[PDB]
Amino acid sequence: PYASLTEIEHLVQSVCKSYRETCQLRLEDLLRQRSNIFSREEVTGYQRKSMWEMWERCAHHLTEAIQYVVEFAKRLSGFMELCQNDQIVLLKAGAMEVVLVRMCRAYNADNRTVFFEGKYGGMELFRALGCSELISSIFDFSHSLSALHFSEDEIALYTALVLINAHRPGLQEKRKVEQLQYNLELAFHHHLSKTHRQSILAKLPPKGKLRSLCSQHVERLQIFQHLHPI
Numbered sequence: 001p002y003a004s005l006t007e008i009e010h011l012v013q014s015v016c017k018s019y020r021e022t023c024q025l026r027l028e029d030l031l032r033q034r035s036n037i038f039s040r041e042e043v044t045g046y047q048r049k050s051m052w053e054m055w056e057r058c059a060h061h062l063t064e065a066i067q068y069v070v071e072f073a074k075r076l077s078g079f080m081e082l083c084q085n086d087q088i089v090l091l092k093a094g095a096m097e098v099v100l101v102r103m104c105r106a107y108n109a110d111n112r113t114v115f116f117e118g119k120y121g122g123m124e125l126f127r128a129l130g131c132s133e134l135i136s137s138i139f140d141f142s143h144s145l146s147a148l149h150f151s152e153d154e155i156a157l158y159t160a161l162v163l164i165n166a167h168r169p170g171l172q173e174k175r176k177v178e179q180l181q182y183n184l185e186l187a188f189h190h191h192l193s194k195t196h197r198q199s200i201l202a203k204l205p206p207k208g209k210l211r212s213l214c215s216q217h218v219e220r221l222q223i224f225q226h227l228h229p230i
């Protein structure tokens with residue numbers, strides 16, 4: 001019922017290994033490459049692309065991102081033991097939320113640029129999409145998250161808890177999800193206490209804010225998918 005220190009340490013290690021096995025680019029590489037910024041020629045090139053081409057570019061990126069998140073979820077202890085309903089409930093709510101959180105790794109707060117197709121560019125890069133307000137919202141959320149200066153280990157633990165969330169409506173074995181959520185909270189708090197970083201807990205975004213942004217994101221994605229299916 002009350003996991004030992006050894007159990008908690010092993011869970012931290014498990015989650016962090018699972019995460020590193022399931023992310024595309026190393027954070028160190030994203031950080032190093034912040035100086036590589038799209039030229040004006042490249043930006044205007046992107047802006048002159050059709051809406052549909054830009055949609056394809058973004059949708060294929062998101063497909064890859066979601067695929068990695070699903071693989072991460074399945075590697076979390078206990079997840080594959082949950083009934084199918086609960087797995088689906090958690091993934092349908094949580095996968096795109098984790099995708100959004102993982103985006104902050106590729107966000108540069110110094111100049112409000114993001115990594116996309118080999119270099120950093122501002123929100124202007126995506127003009128052809130005609131989604132200025134939504135993209136601004138994504139940049140804003142990422143800027144707030146960027147302020148925590150997450151380690152990869154912290155992102156692993158935080159995103160585990162984004163997924164393993166017993167407060168999702170529709171769950172049929174809430175106790176089982178609650179148990180997994182608690183164990184993961186114990187892992188997160190242990191790792192933060194070890195590293196003297198517990199203060200970051202009072203700086204995480206409200207879970208509702210993440211859900212709302214996800215809802216707004218998915219709404220627009222469904223529109224593009226309807227107009228131009230991938």
Ligand SMILES: Cc1ncc(C(=O)Nc2cc(Cl)cc(CN3CCN(C(=O)C4CCCC4)[C@@H](C)C3)c2C)cn1
Binds near residue numbers: 115117126
């Ligand atoms: C290899 C690799 N790793 C990580 C990353 C990355 O996260 N970049 C990244 C990070 C942040 Cl904070 C914001 C953005 C902006 N874009 C805008 C387009 N977009 C959409 O969904 C549109 C589709 C229709 C609706 C809006 C999203 C992909 C977000 C990006 C690209 C990239 N490449």
